[PDB]
Structures are given as C-alpha cells and as structure tokens.
C-alpha cells in the first residue's frame, strides 16, 4: 500500500456528474456550415473596418477570450426547457 | 454601330499559348515545321537522347522484372522517353531556328 | 564555397548506412555493399549541393548589381 | 506552335501510361513499379524553375508509397492541378486548378478506405465536399461582381485572398483538413497536407495576393496551438500542428518572404513524412522533434527560417504570440513523445513498406550543416 | 604558431561573411506581375 | 418587358419553392422548374446555345441522376411539418437582408455566335478546353470505381 | 482456372524456365558470371575467417 | 482426448511438413499475394474474382 | 573584451556626435502612413466621442460570442420533438446579455482611459493600466475571493502588453535597415544601396 491523493467526493456522485456528459451528440457539420458561412461574410467585411488602436484590439481580445464558452461547457449544462 | 461582317471560312485564330520575345538572334526559319527542327538537332542532342533510352530501357526492365512484365515495361519506358527529350530537343532547334536563342551553329550549318 | 562538403558528403553516407542497419536492428557492418553506395552517393550529393548553391549566389550578385547595388571588386570576390 | 508542344507533350505522356496500364492490369504486379517510374519520367517535362523541381520532387516521393495504377494516376492528376494552380493568372485558372484538385483528393479519399472503414471517410468525404463548395461558390459570385465592376480577371483581389485562405486552411477555415484527414488514410493525409500548400505559396508571393490584416494568421496561431494542446487523439495533435504553422507562415508569406516559405515547406514535408508512415518509434520521435523544431534537426532550419522572416518585420505583437504559441506547441509535441516511450510498451504494426522514409530521417538529421547558410 | 595571422585572418574570414550576407540580404521582390520593381531584369514569358 | 420581368421575380419563388418543401422528389422536381426559368431568363439576354447547354446538362442529365440517388436511398421525412410562421418570415428577412442594396447595372442584351465561341475554345483558350476535358475523365475514373 | 496467360515467371517462381529471348539470354549469362565471382569473393573471404570457415552443407536425414 | 487430440495433431504437422520446396515457395507466393489483394479497390479486383486457397482468377467480376 | 581585466562592452563619446548618413540614395516607402480613420478613433480628446468610437468592436466580439453560446444551444435542441417553449425566446437572452455585458466593459475601459489622459494630461502606461484595473473591478463585482484581485492584475496588464508590442516595439526598431551597413556602423566597408529594396507592394485589401 502508497500513500494516494485524496479525491473529493463520493464516489456515486462524481459518477453521476461524468454521466450529464452521455447526452446526444450533434454532428459537427452543422456548426461548422454556420462558421464558415459567416467567416466568410466576416472576412469581407473586416476589409472595411476602421483602423482601431492596438490596446482597444487587445482588450476586444481579452473580451471575447473571457466570454467564449467551450462546446463541452454547453453540452454539459444543455436542458430542453423554456 | 454596325455588326462587322464575318467571313465564317477566314475566322481569325490563334494559338492559345504564345511566347512574349523580340528575336534577339537572327531568324533562320520565322516558323519552322517539325522536320525542320529535328534536322538541327546537334550531335551531343542525339547523344543524350541515346544514352536516356538506354539507361531507361534498363530501369524499365528492372522494375518491370518484379511484376514479370519485364520486356513491355522496357520497350514502354524506352519510347516514351525517347519521345520527351527528342521533343524537347526539337522545342529546343525550334527556338534557336527563330532566332530566341544561341544559333551560330546553325546559321552556319544551313547558311 | 563549403570547402568540406566533401568530406561532410562521405561521412554522412556512412550515417546512412549504419543508420539504416540501426533501425531494421541489425548491427552497424552488415550489408557492406549499402555502405560504399551510401558513401560515394552522398558525397556526389554535396557536392552537387555545393555548386548550386553557389550558382544561385552569382546569380543572385548579377540581379543585386542591376537593381542597382555598388558592389565593389572585394565584394564580386565574395561570390566566387 | 512550339510553346503549345511543351504542355502537349505532359498530356501525351499520361494518355499513353494510362492505357498501357489498363491493357497490363494483372494480378502479377499490382505494384505496379514500372508506372510508378513511367509516371515519374512524365512529371520531368513539366520542370521548368525551382518551385516546379520541387513540385515533382514532392510528388514523386508521394507516388512511391501509393500501392497501384489507380492511385498512382490520381497523383499525377494532383499534380497536373498544382503545376496548373502556380501558372495561373486570373480567376479561372484559379478555380479551374484547385476545384480539379478537390476533386482528386475526393477520389483518392474514397479509393484508400476499407469496407468496414467507408462509414467515417465517406461522412468526413462529404463534408470536405459541402464545406469545399461553400468556399467555391462564395469564390465565384465574388468573382463575377468584381469581373462585372471592373471588366477584367485580375487575380490581386480579397476575394482570391480569402479563396486561398480557405485552401490554405487558416484562421477559420481549417475545419475541412481537421474532419476529413482524421477519417483517411495517412498518406493521404500527409501527401495532401503539404504538397497542395506549395502551389498556393506560391501564387500568393506571384500575383500580390497580400493583406495589411495581420488577424488571420495570428488566430491560426493561437487556435492550433491551444487546440493541439487540448486534444486527446495523435491524429488532431499533427493536424493542428499544420494550422498553426501555416498560420505563421501565412504571416510571414504576405511580406514578401517567399523564399523563406519555400524552404519551410520542403523542410516540413520531409520532417512529417517520417510522423505519418510510422513504422518505427526512433524514426517517429526523429520526426516529432523536427516538427517541434529542435535545433540538431532539419526542422529547425525552417523554423529558423519564419522566425528570422518575422523579427525584420518587427511586429511585436506576432513574436510574443509565435513565442507562447511556440511553447504551448511543445508541450503537445512533447505528450507524443511521452506516448511512444515514457507510457507503455508500444507494439505497432510491422509495414515494412519505408520507401523515402529512411532517406527523409537521414536528409532531417545531415540536412541542418548544408542549409545553415540559409539562416 | 603565429597568432597575429591566425586571429587576422579569422576576423576577415567573419567580416567577408557578414558581408555576403547582407548582400544576399538585399532582396526585391521576384513577383512575375511585380514587373515595376524588377523593369530591367530579362525574362521571357510564356503565357 | 413584363416577360422578362416576371421570369426574373419567378426565379425568386422558384428557389424558395425548394428549400420550403419537405419532400426530396418535389424538391428536385421545383429545382427543374427554376432549371428552366434559368433558361428563359438567359434567352432574355441573347443567349441561346448556353441555355440549351444549361438545359442539356443540368435538366437532361443531373436531374436524372439525382432522382436516380433518391429512389434508392428514400427514407421517410415526412415526420412532421415544422413551416411555423416565425421560422418562415425569419427566413425571408435574412434572404432580404444579403439580397438588399448591391450595386446594380442596367440590363445589357448581347448577341452570341457558335463560330466566334467554338473557334476561341479551340484556338487561343484550348488549354481551358483540355483541363476542363481531363477534369471529366477524373470524375469518371473516381464515380466508376 | 479462368486465365492460361499468365506470365511464366509467376506460374514457376522457384525456377524461370530456359531463357529464350536475347536479353534473357545475356542476363543468364551474366547470372553465372556474378555467381562465379560471388564463390570466388565467397572463397576469399571464408580463408581470412580461418579455421571452419564458417561453411555450412546439408544435414543428414 | 488426449491421445486423439494428438493423433489430429500429428496428422496436420505431417501434412505441413510433407510438402515438397517448389510447393512451398508457391505457398509463400500465394501468401504474399493474400496480403498484397487484401485492398479490395484495386483494379485488378474490378477484373476478376480470385479464388482464396490460390490467388488465381476463378470469375469475371 | 573576453578577459577577465577590464569591463567588458564599451563607452561613447556623448560630446562626440556623428552627422546623419541615408541609408541609401533614393528611398521609395512601400508602407503606407496611417489614415484619418485611425486618427479619428485614435482621439482621446473628447471621452464620450471617444467611447462611441471604439465601441463597435466591443458589440461585435460580444455579439459573436453571444452567436456561439445561441447556436450551440439551438444545435442541441430536437426539430423531431414539438417543443412547448418558444426557442428564440430562450436564445435571445443570451445573445443579449453577451453583447450588452462586452459593451458595458468596453465602455467602461475607453471611458476611464481618456479621462485618465486627460486629467493626466500625458499618454502614459498608467493610463492602460487604470482602465484595465477599473474594468477587472467591474467584472469581479460578485466573484469569490480570488477573483477580485486575479481580473483587475489581468486586465491591466493587457493594456501594458498592448503598449509594449504596439506601440513602443515599433518605434524602438524603426532605425534598423537588414541591408547595405549596419545603422550605427558606417565607416565600415559594406555593399552601398542606390535604392531601399522594395520587397512587396503597399497593400490594398
Ligand atoms: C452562428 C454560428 C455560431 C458561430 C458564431 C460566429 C461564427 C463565426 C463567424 C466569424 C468567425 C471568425 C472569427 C471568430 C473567432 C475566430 C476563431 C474561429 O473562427 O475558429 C473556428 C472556431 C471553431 O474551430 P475548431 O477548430 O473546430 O475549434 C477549436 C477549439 O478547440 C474548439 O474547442 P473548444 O471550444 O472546446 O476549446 C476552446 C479553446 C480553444 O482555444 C481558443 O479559443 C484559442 C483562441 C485564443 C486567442 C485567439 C487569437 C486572439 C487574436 C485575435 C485577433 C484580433 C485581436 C488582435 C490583437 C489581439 C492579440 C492577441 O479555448 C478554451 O479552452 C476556452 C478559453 C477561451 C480562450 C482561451 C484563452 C484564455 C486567455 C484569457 C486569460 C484570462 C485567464 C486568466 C485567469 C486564468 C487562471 C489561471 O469557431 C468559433 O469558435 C467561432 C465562434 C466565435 C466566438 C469567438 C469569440 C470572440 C471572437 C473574436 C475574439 C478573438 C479571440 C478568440 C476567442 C475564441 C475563438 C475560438
Ligand atoms: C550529405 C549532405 C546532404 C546534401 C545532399 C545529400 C545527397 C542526397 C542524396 C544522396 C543519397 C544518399 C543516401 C541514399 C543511399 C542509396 C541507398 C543505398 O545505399 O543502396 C541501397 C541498396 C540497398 O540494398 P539492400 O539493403 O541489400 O536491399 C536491396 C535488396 O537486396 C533488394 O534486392 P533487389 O532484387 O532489388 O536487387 C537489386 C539490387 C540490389 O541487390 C543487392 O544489393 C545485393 C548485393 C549486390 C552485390 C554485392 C555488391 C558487390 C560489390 C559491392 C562492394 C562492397 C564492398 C564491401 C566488401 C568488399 C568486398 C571485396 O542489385 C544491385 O546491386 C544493382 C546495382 C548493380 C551492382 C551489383 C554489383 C555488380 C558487381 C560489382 C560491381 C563492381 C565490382 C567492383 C568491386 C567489387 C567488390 C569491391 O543498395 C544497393 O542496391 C547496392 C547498389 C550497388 C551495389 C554496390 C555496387 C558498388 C560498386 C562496387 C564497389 C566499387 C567502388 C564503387 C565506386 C565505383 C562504382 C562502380
Ligand atoms: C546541373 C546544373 C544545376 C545548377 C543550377 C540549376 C539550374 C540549371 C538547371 C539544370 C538542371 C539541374 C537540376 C538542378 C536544379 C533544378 C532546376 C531546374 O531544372 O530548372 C531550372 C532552370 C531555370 O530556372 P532557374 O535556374 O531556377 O532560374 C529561374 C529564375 O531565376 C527564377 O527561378 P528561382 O526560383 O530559382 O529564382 C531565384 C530564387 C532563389 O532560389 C534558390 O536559391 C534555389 C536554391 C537551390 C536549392 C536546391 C533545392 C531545390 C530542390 C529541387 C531539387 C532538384 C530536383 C531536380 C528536378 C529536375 C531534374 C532535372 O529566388 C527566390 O527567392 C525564389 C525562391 C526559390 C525557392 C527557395 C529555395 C528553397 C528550396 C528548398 C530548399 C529547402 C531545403 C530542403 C532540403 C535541403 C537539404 C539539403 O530551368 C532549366 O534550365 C530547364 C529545365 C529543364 C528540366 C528538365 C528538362 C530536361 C529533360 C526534358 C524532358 C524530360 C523527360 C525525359 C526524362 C529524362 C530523364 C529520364
Ligand atoms: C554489364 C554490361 C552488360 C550487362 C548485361 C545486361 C544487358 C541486357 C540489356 C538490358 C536488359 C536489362 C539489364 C538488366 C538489369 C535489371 C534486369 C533484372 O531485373 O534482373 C533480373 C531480376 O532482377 C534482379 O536480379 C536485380 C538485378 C539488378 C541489376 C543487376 C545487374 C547489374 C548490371 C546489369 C545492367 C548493367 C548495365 C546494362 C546495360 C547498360 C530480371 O529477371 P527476369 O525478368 O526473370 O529475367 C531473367 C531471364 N531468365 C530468368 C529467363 C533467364
Ligand atoms: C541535393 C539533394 C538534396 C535535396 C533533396 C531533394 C533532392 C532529392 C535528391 C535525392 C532523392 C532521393 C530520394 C530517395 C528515395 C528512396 C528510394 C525509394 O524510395 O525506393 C523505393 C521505391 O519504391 C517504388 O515504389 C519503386 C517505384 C519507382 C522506382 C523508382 C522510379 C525511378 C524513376 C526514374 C527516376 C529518375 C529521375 C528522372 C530524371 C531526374 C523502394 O522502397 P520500398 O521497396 O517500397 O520499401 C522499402 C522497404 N524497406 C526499406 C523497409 C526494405
Ligand atoms: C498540360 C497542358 C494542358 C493544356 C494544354 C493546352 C496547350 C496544348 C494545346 C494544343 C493541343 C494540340 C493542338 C496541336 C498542338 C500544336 C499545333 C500543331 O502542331 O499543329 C500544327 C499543324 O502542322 C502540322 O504539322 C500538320 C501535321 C500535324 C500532325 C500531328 C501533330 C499534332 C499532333 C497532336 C496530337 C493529337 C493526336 C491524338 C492525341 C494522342 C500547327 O498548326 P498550323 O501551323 O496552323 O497548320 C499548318 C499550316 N502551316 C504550317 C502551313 C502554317
Ligand atoms: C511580460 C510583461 C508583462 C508584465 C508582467 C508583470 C507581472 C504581471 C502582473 C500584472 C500587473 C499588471 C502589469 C504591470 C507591469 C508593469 C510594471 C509596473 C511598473 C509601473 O507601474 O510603471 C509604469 C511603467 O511600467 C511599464 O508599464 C513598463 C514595464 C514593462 C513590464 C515589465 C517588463 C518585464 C517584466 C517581465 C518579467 C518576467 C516575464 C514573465 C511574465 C508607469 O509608467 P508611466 O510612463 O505611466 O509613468 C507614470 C507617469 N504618468
């Protein structure tokens, strides 16, 4: 017998947990359509964007690095509920 | 205005692929014929042409001899290289005959 | 230019062959024939290396001088 | 009618192997050595500058390890479309080069899979597929407005930009290579995830086809670094290792650099060979590290290479970016290294089948002295 | 052993280098359409 | 000019038609339809062998081909209808949007000859006529198989 | 079997039939020009070896 | 059991080893060959239907 | 010097100055000077100007991020299955909040950095860094413990990098050519350019 880490809670519950994972699983095809379709239009229209400081660019990246949620973190949580 | 008249038998026409060059050589032939270009091939041309066929009818009959097709693969490979560099040295004799490239030699040859 | 590309060339083929035996678990002697192969076709290989790139830098002097660089006769003698 | 031989000749030469092929089809040579040389002969003709040397070099070495006339014959017609995309001067010899590619790659796609493995490439060939006809059709309709407005095919545009932004597969259109090279076979894979790149190199540094935007390679960059570092599969480790690096050199590929490019990709194509077809643990860790970039290999010649481009154009912004970026890379570099000899015994199959691949490990290792001039 | 030469002839063989480089450093753009900045190279297109 | 006008506002309804109905057969069948429309509105323009061609290829052969792939593959969709106003004006308001204020030129009429286009796509554009020739032996060689 | 062309190469692996072309002819002959020279090298090589040799003949049965 | 099990055992390892040179490098060819056909998108494949104790055309595909 | 005697590097004369050489005879700029877009929303002058200014990219990232977290949910959801509650009632909030939430924090960051600057009356790092301080305030109204202190450190540091890799890198750097001599040494004998080299086109995309 070794000296193991502790794991915090119990082991059913974190059981439990890892199965709000085991949901039905979209194809990635229909984001990726979206994404591309809208990249494109963005790359267009970023062409005529104004010319915008580098600290205001660096804190819109800040922003939206903060505020992007990982695809997991949706599937997890989604309930089809109102 | 006015639609001009075409003659359906004399439509002008070109080639699609043209080379943008003012001859800097005299021109020997202004448009040389197939004939033409592979009688100006130089001897060390011919050279090269004999020693490619050679080399690649024994690598054709070496690769060809691991799929027991041995002597087709070697009659192929020989022709078909034979062919690219005998056009490639008429390509060649052609340019030189208009007058893109070196032609002492020739202008010699054939006054 | 390199004035060791040959000897580079003959020792890297030997690093052909013995790695070569290396990998497919043999020991570094076996199979001799690879190893004068190797040798003789690196060594063909930097050398042929070595001209290129030395004709690449000419060419590249002719191109400098007609854009306009005042290479000197010390830097035309850079570029052999 | 001369200057028409020398494209002539290419197409006599594929004709005449393919129906020599077809009338020697037997099960004797499925290999079939001798088209595989008659074809690397043909591809010879087409040489006309460096680039293009270094297009047949690619594809002959490609060629060497597809098994049969019918892939081998897909793969001169890859070539046929790259050698066609890098003399293109206007929209059509644009999108006539590269849709014929798409449909190359569609076919070799569907010619490797097995019977029991058509459900995922023939779901990941359809995506490439609607995803690739997303990118063509936007393509044209922005081609044809500005073909309306100015009268004339010209070639410096965004919307060739952001075309070949999308054959590159940068910034956000990098989810096509991610979905279908996971599905195919690994040659596939590897052949189509580094030659097709030179011909877009280098009608980029060719035609003008820059942009003052620095935000696509930069998010390229980022995404691939951060995203190899939280994958799971080997297979999206090496796949987001390109995004990244392309990224980078897209960077530095609308400066001006196209000679450092050039010798990023032939030095890239050689150190993936090896990760691709692995067949032994030391040639694949051999290959990782040239990937990741350590100095006593190739790989950090054309790293070097980017690097030094980057530091003459002084962007702050894109060396510490390229700095952590870089970092984070190494660590996902580092877990297939931990995963080949520091996890378990590793047992993999014995395809004994290195065509260039000790070549390519030995030109990795002696590469970096020859090439030092460079940088 | 004499030093003087050696160390003499180390540093031109360094300073001949750097030299070479920053020629070679001098690079315009080889663009085909970029005919402006290359106007008096000679090149022939087929096209 | 009212014939010419309608065709151009029908291709409009044509294209909604498909993307609207549930059903795959009538999908294709609409598509055919606006096939045709596509051809009325190219002989308003002058053009007569391109849109025999666009009528040749795409109706005489696609066509067929794609209700070839339906029939074997037909599956049940008629599951439910989901056309709920909401998702229909939310449709029509997103095509409003990109389909709004481009730049727009007056309507040209041009007249096309066979000799003038066969003689360029054999002569000075041959090349396209070759890439475009080995670009169908590709799809033959990769559908067959 | 469905097919009575197939290569004799394939149908004798173990032994090629006589050659009867020219080149398979000079490359017979050159085959026993190589194996005269391999013995010979083969014979050079087992007297630096030494005692033994290193040679190796069939098992009885 | 025993006994039989052996008996079977010694009736499949003299079958094996019965089996003369030439047999057994055309054996090795026919193996070689399997693996090699394993790819069922080659062309040949389209051709013809091999047999699958000897990788011979038996039918046209 | 690599010795161990005397200190190594070296020392300028301060009095000693040396006149200023061109680079090369004729200099031709394929870089192209800022626009009187960039100047416009460069102006810190008037703060409320300021703000509205340089909001638009704050909406858009947010609008974005809002877009992702909407459509992930709306994928999720079954078409097959009726589905008693409206989806766009359930999605708009998101895509709202987002946006109005990135918005409120870019306000605030433009806002406080041109009142900074103009109290201040200099552009300095203080200013990017009070900002950032402010907004990490904001954004940590209600967090645990951590929080408080980790987002105001980040969020000021942003601007800091900014500055750094932005705006003084390049004008650090500006002197250095790469060909014919180097900057500062001259007199040594090295290829002299008659023309800069003009390794791409000023850009128009
Ligand atoms: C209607 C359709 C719906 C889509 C909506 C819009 C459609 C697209 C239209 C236009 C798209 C083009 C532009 C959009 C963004 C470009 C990305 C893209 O398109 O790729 C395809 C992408 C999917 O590609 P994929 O390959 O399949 O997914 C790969 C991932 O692994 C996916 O797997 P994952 O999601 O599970 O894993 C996510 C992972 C993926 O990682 C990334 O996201 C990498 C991105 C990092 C930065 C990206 C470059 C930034 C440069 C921006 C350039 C502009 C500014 C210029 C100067 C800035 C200098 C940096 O990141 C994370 O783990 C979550 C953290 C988020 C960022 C991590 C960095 C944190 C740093 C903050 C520090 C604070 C912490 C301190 C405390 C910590 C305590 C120790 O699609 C999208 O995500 C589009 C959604 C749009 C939301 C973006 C939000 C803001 C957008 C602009 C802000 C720029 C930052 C980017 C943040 C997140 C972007 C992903
Ligand atoms: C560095 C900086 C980087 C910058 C640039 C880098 C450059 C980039 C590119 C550079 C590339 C370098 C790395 C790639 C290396 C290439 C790969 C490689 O090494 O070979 C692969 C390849 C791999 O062989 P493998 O691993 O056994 O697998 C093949 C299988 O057997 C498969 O079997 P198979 O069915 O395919 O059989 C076909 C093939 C493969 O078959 C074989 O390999 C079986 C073995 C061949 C017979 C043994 C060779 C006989 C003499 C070799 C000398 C060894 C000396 C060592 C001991 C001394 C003995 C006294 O048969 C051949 O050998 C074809 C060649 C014809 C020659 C055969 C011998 C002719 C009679 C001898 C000629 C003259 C005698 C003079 C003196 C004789 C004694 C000294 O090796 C060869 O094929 C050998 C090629 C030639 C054999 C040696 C001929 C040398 C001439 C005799 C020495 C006289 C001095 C030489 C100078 C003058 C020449 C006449
Ligand atoms: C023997 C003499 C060789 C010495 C010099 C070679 C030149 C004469 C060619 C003579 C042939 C020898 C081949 C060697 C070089 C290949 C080049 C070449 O051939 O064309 C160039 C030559 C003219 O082009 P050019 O000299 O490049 O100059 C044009 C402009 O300057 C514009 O071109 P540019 O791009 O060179 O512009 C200058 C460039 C500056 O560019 C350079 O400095 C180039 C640096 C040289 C690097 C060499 C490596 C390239 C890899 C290709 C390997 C060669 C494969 C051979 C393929 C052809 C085989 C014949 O500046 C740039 O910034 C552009 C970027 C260039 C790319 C960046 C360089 C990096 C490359 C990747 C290196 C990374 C390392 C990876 C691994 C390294 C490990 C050690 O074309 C010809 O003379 C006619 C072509 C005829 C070829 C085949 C025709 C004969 C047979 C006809 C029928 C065939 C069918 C029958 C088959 C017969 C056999 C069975
Ligand atoms: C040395 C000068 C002359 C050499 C004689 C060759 C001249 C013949 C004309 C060219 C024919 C091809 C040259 C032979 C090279 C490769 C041939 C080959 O593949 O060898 C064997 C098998 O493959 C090998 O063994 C590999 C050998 C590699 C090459 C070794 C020979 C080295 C010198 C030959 C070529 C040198 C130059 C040739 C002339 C320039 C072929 O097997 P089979 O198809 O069954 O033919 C055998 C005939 N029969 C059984 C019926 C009796
Ligand atoms: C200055 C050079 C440095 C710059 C680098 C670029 C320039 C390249 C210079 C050298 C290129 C050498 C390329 C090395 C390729 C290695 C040879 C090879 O791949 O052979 C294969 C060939 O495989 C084939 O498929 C053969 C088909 C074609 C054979 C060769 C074609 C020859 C065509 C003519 C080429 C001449 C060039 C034409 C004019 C230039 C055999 O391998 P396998 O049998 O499949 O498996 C090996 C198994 N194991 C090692 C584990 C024992
Ligand atoms: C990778 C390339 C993909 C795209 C390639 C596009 C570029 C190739 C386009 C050309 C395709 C082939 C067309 C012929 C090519 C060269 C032209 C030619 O040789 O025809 C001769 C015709 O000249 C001849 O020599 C006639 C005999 C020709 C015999 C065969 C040569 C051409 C063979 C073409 C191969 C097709 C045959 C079947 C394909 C296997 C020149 O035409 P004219 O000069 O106008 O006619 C002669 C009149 N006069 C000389 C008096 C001015
Ligand atoms: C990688 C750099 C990132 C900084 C890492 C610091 C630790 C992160 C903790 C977050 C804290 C926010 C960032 C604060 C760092 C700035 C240093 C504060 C010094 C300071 O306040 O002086 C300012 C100038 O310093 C400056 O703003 C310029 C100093 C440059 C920052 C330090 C550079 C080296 C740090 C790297 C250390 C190790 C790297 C690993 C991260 C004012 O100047 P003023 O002009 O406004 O005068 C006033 C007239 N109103």
């Not at chain 1, 790359?43 to 915008?52: C, H, L, Q, S, T």
Request: glycine residues 6%; charged residues 15%.
């Amino acid at each position: 017998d070794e000296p193991k880490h502790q794991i915090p809670g119990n082991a059913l519950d974190n059981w439990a947990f890892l199965r709000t994972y085991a949901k039905p699983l979209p194809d990635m095809i229909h984001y990726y359509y979206y994404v591309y379709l809208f990249g494109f239009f963005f790359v267009y229209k970023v062409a005529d964007f104004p010319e915008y400081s580098p600290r205001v660019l660096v804190m819109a990246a800040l922003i939206g690095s903060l505020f992007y949620v990982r695809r997991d973190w949706v599937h997890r949580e989604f309930k089809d509920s109102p | 205005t006015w639609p001009k008249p075409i003659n359906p038998y004399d439509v002008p026409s070109s080639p699609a692929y043209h080379r943008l060059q003012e001859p800097s050589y005299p021109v020997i032939d202004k448009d040389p014929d197939f004939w033409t270009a592979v009688s100006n091939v130089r001897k060390e041309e011919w050279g090269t042409t004999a020693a490619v066929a050679a080399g690649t009818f024994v690598m054709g009959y070496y690769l060809g001899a691991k799929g027991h097709t041995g002597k087709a693969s070697a009659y192929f490979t020989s022709f078909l290289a034979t062919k690219s560099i005998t056009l490639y040295h008429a390509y060649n004799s052609a340019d030189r005959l208009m007058g893109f490239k070196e032609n002492s030699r020739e202008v010699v040859k054939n006054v | 230019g390199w004035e060791y590309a040959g000897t580079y060339g003959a020792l890297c083929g030997m690093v052909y062959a013995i790695g070569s035996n290396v990998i497919s678990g043999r020991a570094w002697f076996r199979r001799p024939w690879v190893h004068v192969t190797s040798v003789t076709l690196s060594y063909l290989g930097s050398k042929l290396l070595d001209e290129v790139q030395d004709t690449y830098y000419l060419e590249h002097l002719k191109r400098v001088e007609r854009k306009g660089l005042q290479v000197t006769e010390e830097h035309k003698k850079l570029f052999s | 009618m001369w200057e028409n031989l020398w494209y002539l000749d290419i197409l006599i030469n594929v004709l005449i192997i393919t129906i020599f092929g077809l009338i020697s089809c037997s099960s004797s040579a499925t290999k079939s050595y001798d088209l595989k040389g008659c074809f690397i002969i043909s591809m010879v003709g087409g040489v006309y500058d460096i680039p293009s040397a270094i297009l047949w070099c690619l594809a002959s070495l490609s060629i060497l390890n597809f098994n049969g006339f019918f892939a081998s014959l897909f793969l001169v017609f890859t070539w046929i479309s790259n050698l066609f995309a890098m003399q293109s001067l206007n929209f059509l010899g644009i999108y006539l080069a590269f849709e014929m590619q798409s449909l190359c790659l569609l076919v070799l796609g569907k010619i490797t899979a097995n019977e029991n493995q058509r459900w995922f490439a023939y779901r990941g060939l359809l995506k490439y597929l609607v995803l690739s006809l997303i990118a063509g059709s936007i393509f044209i309709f922005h081609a044809s407005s500005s073909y309306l407005q100015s009268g004339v095919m010209i070639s410096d545009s965004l919307v060739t930009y952001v075309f070949l932004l999308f054959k590159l597969g940068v910034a956000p259109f990098h989810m096509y290579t991610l979905e279908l090279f996971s599905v195919v076979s690994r040659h596939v894979a590897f052949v189509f995830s580094t030659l097709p790149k030179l011909s877009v190199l280098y009608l980029i540094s060719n035609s003008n086809i820059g942009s003052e935007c620095v935000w696509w390679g930069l998010i390229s960059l980022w995404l691939g670094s951060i995203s190899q570092y939280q994958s799971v599969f080997v297979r999206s480790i090496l796949l987001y290792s390109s995004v990244a690096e392309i990224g980078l050199v897209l960077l530095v590929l609308q400066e001006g650099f196209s000679w450092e490019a050039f010798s990023w990709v032939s030095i890239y194509f050689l150190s993936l060979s090896g990760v691709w077809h692995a067949n032994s643990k030391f040639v694949s860790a051999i290959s990782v590290a040239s990937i990741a970039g350590l100095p006593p290999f190739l790989g950090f010649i054309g790293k070097a290479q980017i690097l030094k481009s980057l530091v003459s154009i002084n962007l702050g912004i894109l060396i510490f970016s390229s700095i952590l970026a870089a970092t984070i890379s190494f660590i996902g570099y580092l877990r297939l290294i931990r995963l080949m000899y520091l996890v378990s015994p590793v047992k993999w199959k014995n395809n004994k089948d290195s065509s260039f691949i000790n070549w390519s490990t030995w030109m990795l290792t002696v590469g970096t002295l020859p090439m030092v001039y460079s940088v | 052993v004499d030093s003087q030469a050696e160390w003499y002839a180390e540093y031109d063989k360094l300073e001949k280098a750097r030299q070479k480089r920053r020629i070679w450093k001098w690079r315009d753009s080889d663009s085909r359409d970029e005919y402006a900045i290359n106007a008096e190279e000679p090149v022939i297109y087929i096209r | 000019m009212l014939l010419i006008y309608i065709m151009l506002s029908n291709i409009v309804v044509l294209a909604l038609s498909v993307v609207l109905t549930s059903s795959p057969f009538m999908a294709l069948m609409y598509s055919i339809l606006l096939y045709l429309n596509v051809q009325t509105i190219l002989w308003s323009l002058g053009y007569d062998f391109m849109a025999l061609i666009y009528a040749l290829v795409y109706v005489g052969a696609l066509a067929v081909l794609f209700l070839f792939v339906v029939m074997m593959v037909r599956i049940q969709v008629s599951t439910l209808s989901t056309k709920t106003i909401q998702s229909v004006l939310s449709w029509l308001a997103i095509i409003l949007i990109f389909s709004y204020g481009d730049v727009s030129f007056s309507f040209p009429c041009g007249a096309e000859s066979l000799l003038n286009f066969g003689t360029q796509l054999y002569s000075s554009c041959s090349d396209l006529t070759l890439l475009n020739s080995l670009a169908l032996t590709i799809a033959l060689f990769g559908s067959l198989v | 079997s469905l097919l009575k062309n197939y290569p004799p190469s394939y149908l004798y692996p173990f032994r090629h039939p006589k050659p009867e072309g020219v080149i398979e002819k000079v490359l017979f002959n050159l085959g026993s020009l190589f194996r005269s020279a391999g013995q010979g090298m083969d014979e050079l090589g087992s007297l630096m070896l030494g005692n033994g040799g290193m040679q190796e003949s069939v098992g009885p049965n | 059991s025993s006994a039989n099990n052996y008996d079977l055992l010694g009736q499949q390892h003299k079958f094996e080893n019965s089996k003369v040179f030439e047999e057994m490098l055309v054996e090795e060819e026919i193996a070689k060959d399997r693996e090699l056909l394993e790819d069922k998108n080659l062309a040949v494949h389209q051709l013809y239907i091999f047999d699958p104790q000897t990788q011979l055309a038996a039918r046209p595909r | 010097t690599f010795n161990y005697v005397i200190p190594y590097g070296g020392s300028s004369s301060y009095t000693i100055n040396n006149e200023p050489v061109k680079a090369e005879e004729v200099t031709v700029d394929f870089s192209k000077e800022p626009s009187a877009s960039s100047l416009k929303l460069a102006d810190k002058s008037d703060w409320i100007a300021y703000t509205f200014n340089n909001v638009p990219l704050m909406a858009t990232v947010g609008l974005l991020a809002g877009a992702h977290e909407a459509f992930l949910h709306y994928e999720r959801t079954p078409i097959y299955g009726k589905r008693t509650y409206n989806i766009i009632k359930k999605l708009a909030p998101i895509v709202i909040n987002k946006t109005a939430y990135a918005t409120l924090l870019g306000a605030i960051f433009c806002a406080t950095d041109a009142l900074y600057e103009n109290y201040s009356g200099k552009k300095s790092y203080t200013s990017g860094m009070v900002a950032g301080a402010a907004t990490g305030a904001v954004f940590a109204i209600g967090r645990p413990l951590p929080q408080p202190l980790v987002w105001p450190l980040v969020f000021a540091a942003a601007p800091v990098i900014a500055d750094l890799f932005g705006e003084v890198y390049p004008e650090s750097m500006k002197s250095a050519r790469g060909y014919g001599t180097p900057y500062g040494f001259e007199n040594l004998d090295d290829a002299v350019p008659t023309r800069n080299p003009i390794r791409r086109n000023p850009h128009h995309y």
